Amino acid sequence: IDTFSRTGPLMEAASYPAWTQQLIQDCSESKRRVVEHELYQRMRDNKLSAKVMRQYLIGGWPVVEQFALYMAQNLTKTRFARHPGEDMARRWLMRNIRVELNHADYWVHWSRAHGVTLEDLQAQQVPPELHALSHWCWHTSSADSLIVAIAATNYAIEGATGEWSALVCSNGIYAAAFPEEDRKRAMKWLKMHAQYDDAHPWEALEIIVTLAGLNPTKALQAELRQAICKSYDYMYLFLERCMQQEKTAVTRERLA
Amino acid sequence: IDTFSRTGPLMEAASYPAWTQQLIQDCSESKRRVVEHELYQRMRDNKLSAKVMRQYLIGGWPVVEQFALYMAQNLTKTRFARHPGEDMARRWLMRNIRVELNHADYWVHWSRAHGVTLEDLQAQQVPPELHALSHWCWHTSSADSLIVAIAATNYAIEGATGEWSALVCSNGIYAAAFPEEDRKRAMKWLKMHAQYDDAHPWEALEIIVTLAGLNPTKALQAELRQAICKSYDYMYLFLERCMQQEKTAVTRERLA
Ligand SMILES: CCCCCCCCC/C=C/C(=O)O
Ligand SMILES: CCCCCCCCC/C=C/C(=O)O
Ligand SMILES: [Fe+3]
Ligand SMILES: [Fe+3]
């Protein structure tokens, strides 16, 4: 039968098969260097330059705007009662597309609090290192299997995003730096995503495990690992380029 | 500007531009012959043969199963803040994909109440006249513009479906023919769709009008009309083939 059914708590690695625990371990350093990135420690402390903050918001926009569209593309690959994991995916995607209803609007508001206009967002004037994530997300959503594309976007990206957004909000400095009358609206996107204990990525993982079963091939495991690490690695590429610009911007004003 | 904003009530033709009222008039006979079809008058009265009832349920299944998938494909065509109608479509599609969460399950239950198993549904052993609707729906959802595909599926098909399902439920005979212990579960799909005053098709129309504006080209109007009438016409083709089989089945037992 090879059929997976969770007994343990949703949000614990030990509730899943050994291969899934292995997958988490194999991707852990790729994840870590994103969720603990220096850029986020600086953002938390309100230290980032206007230039970099602007690039971050513009660069992140396409992935945020199109996030429910990746989910939609994945829904399009599912069929009713073809496999238990596939029914689980269908229902989950139908429920969670709705969750994103206002999230692009919140990003627009976050952006405007830093002087980034809707026009600025739409112009997409950022380095290519910043656009790579969006192209990967569409490629996997378009061309890959459901299980792989869900791993790349709902597990990897949303999981890491819960953690970086929690880090940004973790000491109150960033939020308190906004004028009181601007703060609620500016912070909304971050507040809605800020959680270490968010079920979303664990629900995605559960779906992936159900799709794959107890004994997936090594080849499928490799496909998942590579897709998940690709997502983290493109986030890392984005952040590294941002930090290069940060050093230049800060250094210029230090010397000026 | 050419921009449309509704002043009147949602569910009234007079609230929309003259071209939209014209479009409704041009499609009205195509619609009528579906929503008043003899098959539905017979279904209402519990008269349909086991054979035809079975074919109806099997034949309708793909469109029901894939209905949220058409919506998903249409969501994939939208972009944030590119046009006011397109924002309206995006938000509406994200909200209404969720609405369908349980609807395929309800159809399965309706089907089982007539001895049609999930296996039967999956086998799709029906005439080609019955499959044409599903192929059209996927073609338009896949290849056409958002405005056209939404007109074909959320306006035309869901609108007509509100009306035929209301007709089937209109005198209590069909429902009362089910044994009491089987009735709630058997009737659920029909009950959830049975409405003449459903907002869904009127919300779809409003989106279409907002997308098209006050002065769409004659060419776009023609594309909408032809897409809407195609949907009704494939429903009509389905129903005509069903009634041909009904006459044969009933006549055989009359003479036997
Ligand atoms: C390091 C690159 C930053 C990418 C920007 C975050 C993308 C987050 C996608 C999720 C959006 C949402 O749930 O509303
Ligand atoms: C005449 C052909 C019958 C087609 C079968 C109805 C298709 C209805 C599509 C809507 C399904 C839903 O809202 O859950
Ligand atoms: Fe979100
Ligand atoms: Fe429905």
Side-chain angles (χ1 to χ4, degrees), chain B residues 34 40 56 59-61 63-65 67 100 103-104 107 133 157-158 161 164 189 193 234-236 238-239:
Chain B
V34 171
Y40 294 125
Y56 188 91
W61 169 238
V63 179
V64 173
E65 179 222 336
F67 205 67
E100 304 306 311
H103 292 193
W107 190 274
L133 184 60
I157 295 169
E158 191 82 345
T161 293
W164 72 251
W189 188 95
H193 301 77
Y234 287 129
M235 295 179 80
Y236 186 69
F238 186 121
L239 295 160

Side-chain angles (χ1 to χ4, degrees), chain A residues 34 39-40 56 59-61 63-65 67 70 100 102-104 107 130 133 153 157-158 161 164 189 193 200 234-236 238-239:
Chain A
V34 171
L39 188 145
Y40 294 125
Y56 188 91
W61 169 238
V63 179
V64 173
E65 179 222 336
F67 205 67
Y70 311 138
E100 304 306 311
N102 292 313
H103 292 193
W107 190 274
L130 272 58
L133 184 60
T153 58
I157 295 169
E158 191 82 345
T161 293
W164 72 251
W189 188 95
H193 301 77
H200 177 124
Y234 287 129
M235 295 179 80
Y236 186 69
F238 186 121
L239 295 160

